[PDB]
Every structure is written in C-alpha cells, then in structure tokens.
Amino acid sequence: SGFRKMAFPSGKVEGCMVQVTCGTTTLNGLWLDDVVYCPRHVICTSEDMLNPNYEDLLIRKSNHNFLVQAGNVQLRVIGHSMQNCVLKLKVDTANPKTPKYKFVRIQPGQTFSVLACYNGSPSGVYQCAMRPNFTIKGSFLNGSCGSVGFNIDYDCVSFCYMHHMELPTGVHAGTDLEGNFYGPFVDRQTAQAAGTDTTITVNVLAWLYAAVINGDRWFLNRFTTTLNDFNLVAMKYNYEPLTQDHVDILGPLSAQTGIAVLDMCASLKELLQNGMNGRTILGSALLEDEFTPFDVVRQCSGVT
Amino acid sequence: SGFRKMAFPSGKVEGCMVQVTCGTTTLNGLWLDDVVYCPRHVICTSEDMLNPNYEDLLIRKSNHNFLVQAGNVQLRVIGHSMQNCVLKLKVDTANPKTPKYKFVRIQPGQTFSVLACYNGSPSGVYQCAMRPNFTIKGSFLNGSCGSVGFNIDYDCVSFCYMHHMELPTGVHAGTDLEGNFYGPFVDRQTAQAAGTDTTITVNVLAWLYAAVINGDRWFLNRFTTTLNDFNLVAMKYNYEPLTQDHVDILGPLSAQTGIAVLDMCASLKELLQNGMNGRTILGSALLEDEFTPFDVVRQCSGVT
Numbered sequence A, B: 001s002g003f004r005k006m007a008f009p010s011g012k013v014e015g016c017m018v019q020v021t022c023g024t025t026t027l028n029g030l031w032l033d034d035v036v037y038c039p040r041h042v043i044c045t046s047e048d049m050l051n052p053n054y055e056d057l058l059i060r061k062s063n064h065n066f067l068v069q070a071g072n073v074q075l076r077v078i079g080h081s082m083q084n085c086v087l088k089l090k091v092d093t094a095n096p097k098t099p100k101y102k103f104v105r106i107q108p109g110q111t112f113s114v115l116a117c118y119n120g121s122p123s124g125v126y127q128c129a130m131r132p133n134f135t136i137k138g139s140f141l142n143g144s145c146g147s148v149g150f151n152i153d154y155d156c157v158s159f160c161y162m163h164h165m166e167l168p169t170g171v172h173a174g175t176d177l178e179g180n181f182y183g184p185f186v187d188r189q190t191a192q193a194a195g196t197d198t199t200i201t202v203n204v205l206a207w208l209y210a211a212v213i214n215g216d217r218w219f220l221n222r223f224t225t226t227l228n229d230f231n232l233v234a235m236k237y238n239y240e241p242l243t244q245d246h247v248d249i250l251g252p253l254s255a256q257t258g259i260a261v262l263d264m265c266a267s268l269k270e271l272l273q274n275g276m277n278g279r280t281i282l283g284s285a286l287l288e289d290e291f292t293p294f295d296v297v298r299q300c301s302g303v304t
C-alpha cells in the first residue's frame, strides 16, 4: 500500500564519498578502488570559470596540490589525469568500502538516486530522472559538485551521474563517470539555456499503472486509442512520442493490472485534454513522470 | 538551486537492519548494541491477528524460536521480552555497526526518513511526516514490518518510528521504539479508521518560504492577515490552526527572505481560497506539507 518517490539506500555510496580540495576550491570526490573521481573544475578559481583552459590550468598542478580527505584521514595522491570533464586522482590506498560497481551512461527518461554531499559528507538522498533535455531537476547548492547519481542492482552500484553545475535556470547539468556531459553542456560559466523539457510519457503511464495497483482508479475510462492518435495529443502537450518499445516495456504492468497499454493511453489522453478537475492521483495534482516502468514494478513487488 | 523531498543518507540505519523469523512469520528487526527490536506481531500466525493475546502467545516462545539473521550470519538469542508492542531480543553480540543513537517519540507534523526493508534487506528510502491523525502515508508491502523511521543529527541517529501495520485505507500505523503506537491504533486486524487528515500549516508556510528562496514567487501578494483571520480560513480548509509557536519557528525563514510570517499567511490564504489556477510551486500542483521549517533551512543551507 502506498507509492512514494523512493531512492535507493545510500550506504554503499556514502562509503565512497571524499572531500577534494585544490587551491581554494573544495568539492566532492568518489573514491572507488585506488582512484578518486571529481569534476575537473576543482582546479579553477571563480575568475577562471568564465573561459577556462583546463589543459593549461592542469599543467600548474602536481599530485601534492590535490588534497583528498576521506572523513578525517588524508589520502596520498600518487597520480592525476584528466578524462573529459573529470579528474582521476590515483591514491595509494584502495577504498576498503568499495562496493561492486559499474559506470553507466544513462538514457533520457531513466531515473536514479542522488546522494547530495558537501565537503565530502552526505547531506541527503533523493530520486531524479535524466530529463529529455539532459538536465536534472536536483537540489544542489555551492559545494555539491562531485555528488553522484546511481542505481543499485542487489549488490552492484551503477554510477551514472556526477554533478558539475547549475544552469542560470536553476536546473542541473553533469557528466557520466567517464566525464562526458549529458546533453550539450560545457563546464564553463557561460550562457547555457536548456532545451524543451518534455514529459516522459512512458513514465507517466507507468505511474498511472502504479495508481491503479494502489487503488486510485478514478481516471480509468471507457476509451481506447492508437499509438498514432495518442502521439497527436502527446505532441500538443510536449510529451515524448510513445513508441512500440515503450508499449513493450509496459507489458508486465499491463499484464499485472489487465489494463491494455492503449486503454491506459486513452486515460492519459483524457487527463491531458481535461486536466484533473481538482482531483489527485497518488497524492499528486500533476502527472508524475519520474518513475520508470522498472521503478513501479520494483516498488510494487518489494525488490531489495 | 532546486528543492526536493530529501531523505537522510540511510547508511547508518542499513547497518542495523536484520531479519527476524518466528515460526512462519518473517519481518525486519533493528539491531542496536546487543538488542534486536521488532514488532511483537512476529509471534502471530495470520489466524492469530484477528484478536491476539500477545502475553499468552509469547508464553509458547523460547529464545531459540526467534531466528535472527544479520545479512547471512545468525545471531544467538540469549533473552527476549515484550515492551508495549515491540519485542526486544537480547543477542550475544553487540552490532559492530551500531551508530550513536537515541529513541524519540515525535510529534504530529514532524518529518522523518523511512528505510523500507524486506527480509532484513533495505529496498529504498523516502521522506515521511507523522500526520496530525498519527498515520503515515508510506510505501510498504507485506514483509516491511519492522522497517524504521529516523532523523540524523550529524552522527546521531534518532529512531522515531517502527512500521507495524497498514490500515484498510492504505495508510500506515506504527510505534516509537518503546513500542507505543502513534495515535489510537492497536496491533490487531480489526476495523481501524483514521481520523481527519488535516494539513500541517506550519510546514506549508515553510515550503512557501523554500519556494521564494528558489525563485518561485508568483503567489506572493500585496496582502497581510492576522493569526485569528488566517485560522478562520485554515479551519474551513482542514488546515491545522497556526499558533504563535509556529510563527516563532518560522522566524529564521522570515528573516532570511524578509517576508513577514503574516504576509506569507495572506499568500497562503489566497492560495486556499483561489487555488493555483493551473500553476505550480516547486514543481507541485498542490500545497506541500511534509517539509518542516527545520527541513527547509537544512536543505537551503547544506547541512551534512
């Protein structure tokens, strides 16, 4: 009973968080095995951020300039390199708390948990989605850079995001753990505006299935539709076009509830056209799009 | 930038979760020092739950009947006792992962994080509030009993909740860590309906302050009100009456934003009377009440 925006337990990730300082800049790092990963802008001054030449700024830095502290103990830096927009600091000690891990580059629409940190210390955990415009709507303040996003498959942590910056619009941009930005963003204090933030249709449908499972059924109607007809409506409302791949991914939820995917689409179509009329669905007055079909099945089945 | 429903990092609590089995019933336990705490209904069969005599059911149980497993290792039970609606299983090994902890009985309106578990394994973490009717709107399935709610003050974990049951209404009831239920609920499969779920006014105001801090200011108006006038409106909308204590707790947010508490009340009064007119506040289309004034300051200041 009940449906919440649930994050993965963060313990495995808390054991990897460190503080990295270079000059007067302090941010978070991720310590996995004998490498600490962090945003390369740790080498910048606030003056440098307008147009930094990272290769040139990095020439003036040695191993002893990167101060890495895991809790209250100092790690010895024996190597450093830049990979895309991240620095990799080789330390002389493997993190004894290193979980089983992978680095993944997620697709827009996929969700993940963020462990927001400041000065190497965890402050909170929340659930996110990579928006279709490759931004994330996070909760980050100055000093949160280097905080990571991840998913957990039983004992394996798949790191998918590292926080780098906030756009002047209040949304967030960052990289995968290879240092490649999601979207067109660059690690520079320049005019960067995000594209259209479209709604993740397959996630809204998954959340409608979660609502039916939990007893919120008022929006179910007597109608059906086709993918092409639904997509005419999805386009008008800045919703992602629904494909056969999305329908197939919703198959298990359709089977569990007995509500055909296209009938759920017709319910969604009427909700777009008429709104909620002051009603709520799973305690929300808007259509939620940050639960994937996998998230709904996981939460509705009790996977640990 | 940004404002999210953020939970505390769960690592310190994950290290305390164990599985407790008695007969054919398995649920979660909390292992702190050499004691495992769990709901007393672990001694019941599904037949017993209609009207259980816990003292009588417990007479037929010995230490060796409580199977406690921490991950994959078995804990040896050397004593058991019932305190209100919880069992305390004395084990021969202190949990090496026991954090600094306290047991607190929270007030309605206060928020906390829940680490939902099944079979002693964490599945997710989310943020809750103790409703004014003493229920929590959680996300729990069969096997989640014994999952706990907590707050963290730097290194100290204050456990405030242990999950015991779901009401036929889909909301949740449980106890503090002394085994006393929040509200009038009893651990019996009987007709238990929750009282009026009123809105936590002081939390809605705190969240309006969080919105102004983050740039969502459309709802600010040219009006002010008085506590008595505001409370006439709060009563009509099933909002908690606002007291001078609530105004005082909002003092730091009022000071940070320069918006007097009673002016924010007048903004809230117009939002109640007119609705949002299809607009959103911090990505919500309803007035959020599960952030306390302490939560807003913590999130808006970056406390770790």
Ligand SMILES: COc1ccc(Br)cc1[C@@H](N)C(=O)Nc1cnccc1C
Residues within 6 Å of the ligand: A041, A049, A140, A141, A142, A143, A144, A145, A164, A165, A166, A172, A186, A187, A188, A189, B001
């Ligand atoms: C002004 O700081 C930057 C400018 C450009 C870049 Br690349 C990076 C920063 C960085 N020092 C920072 O702290 N970023 C950030 C991210 N999320 C939330 C808040 C803030 C401010």
Ligand SMILES: COc1ccc(Br)cc1[C@@H](N)C(=O)Nc1cnccc1C
Residues within 6 Å of the ligand: A001, B041, B049, B140, B141, B142, B143, B144, B145, B164, B165, B166, B172, B186, B187, B188, B189
């Ligand atoms: C039917 O189970 C009970 C009846 C009464 C009581 Br006291 C306790 C239970 C318990 N066996 C249970 O699993 N509870 C529960 C809690 N949250 C979500 C889901 C469920 C079912």
